[PDB]
Paper text:
Here we use a robust deep learning pipeline to design complex folds and soluble analogues of integral membrane proteins. Unique membrane topologies, such as those from G-protein-coupled receptors, are not found in the soluble proteome, and we demonstrate that their structural features can be recapitulated in solution. Biophysical analyses demonstrate the high thermal stability of the designs, and experimental structures show remarkable design accuracy. The soluble analogues were functionalized with native structural motifs, as a proof of concept for bringing membrane protein functions to the soluble proteome, potentially enabling new approaches in drug discovery.
We started by designing soluble analogues of the claudin fold, a class of proteins involved in the formation of tight junctions, which are critical in controlling the flow of molecules between layers of epithelial and endothelial cells. Claudin folds are composed of an α/β mixed secondary structure in which there are four transmembrane α-helices and an extracellular β-sheet. We tested 13 designs for the claudin-like fold (CLF), of which ten were found to be expressed in soluble form. Five designs were further biochemically characterized; three were monomers in solution according to size-exclusion chromatography with multi-angle light scattering (SEC–MALS) and were folded, with two showing a melting temperature (Tm) above 90 °C. The CLF designs showed sequence identity below 13% relative to the native fold and nearest e-values to natural sequences below 0.063. The CLF design series showed that our approach could be used successfully to design soluble analogues of membrane proteins with simple membrane-spanning topologies such as four-helix bundles. To assess the design accuracy, we attempted to crystallize the soluble analogues of membrane topologies and obtained high-resolution X-ray structures for one claudin, one rhomboid protease and two GPCR designed folds. The CLF_4 structure exhibited exceptional design precision in both backbone and side chains, as indicated by an r.m.s.d.Cα of 0.73 Å and r.m.s.d.fa of 1.28 Å. Comparison between CLF_4 and the native claudin demonstrated accurate secondary structural element positioning, with an r.m.s.d.Cα of 3.63 Å and most of the deviation arising from the β-sheet region. In addition, the four helices were mostly hydrophilic, as evidenced by the low lipophilicity potential on the surface.
Author numbering: 1 to 101, 107 to 187
Write the structure that this text describes.
């Protein structure tokens, strides 16, 4: 049955690599929003900064006051993504060290710890994603019928797929832990 455990562990490692990749891509991917009644201006959200890019090619970095409704939600999303990136990289390093390596029961405990932290991080990320998506959908509802907002959900979908892959890896690690501790 150790071969089954090996298959599950390597699948979890693969899913963790994929999760880290998708998380870095999501952090790199900016949130684009074609602002309305502005002469085809696009509001780009990148690294906690807001940029207006005009059709002619002008780009202005606009500082958003801490009081606007968008700043807190977007910053919470950014910070959750950043913290998830750090946590996932830490857990990846720990799982690699585990696979390389003392005490089988301690390794079972370590796998349980890894999976629990992975699950918590994935669920917090999904929670932040849901909050930000609800905010954006309400923002688009607060608009006239003719006026339409075209948002590029690339980063949000990347983050959601990454959180789901992390959850899958966590549940695979949990299967390993259960089938081994018993």
């Amino acid at each position: 049955n150790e071969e089954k455990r090996e298959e599950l562990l390597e699948e979890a490692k693969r899913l963790l690599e994929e999760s880290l990749k998708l998380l870095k891509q999501a952090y790199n991917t900016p949130i684009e929003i074609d602002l309305p009644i502005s002469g085809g201006v696009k509001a780009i959200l990148y690294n906690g900064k807001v940029y207006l890019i005009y059709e002619n090619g002008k780009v202005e970095e606009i500082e958003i006051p801490e009081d606007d409704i968008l700043y807190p939600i977007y910053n919470k999303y950014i910070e959750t993504l950043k913290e998830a990136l750090k946590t996932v990289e830490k857990l990846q390093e720990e799982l690699e060290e585990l696979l390389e390596n003392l005490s089988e029961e301690e390794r079972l405990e370590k796998l349980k710890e890894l999976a629990e932290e992975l699950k918590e991080t994935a669920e917090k990320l999904l929670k932040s994603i849901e909050e930000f998506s609800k905010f954006l959908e309400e923002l688009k509802k607060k608009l006239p019928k003719n006026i339409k907002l075209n948002i590029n959900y690339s980063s949000i979908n990347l983050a959601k797929e990454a959180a789901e892959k992390a959850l899958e890896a966590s549940e695979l690690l949990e299967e390993v832990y259960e089938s081994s501790g018993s």
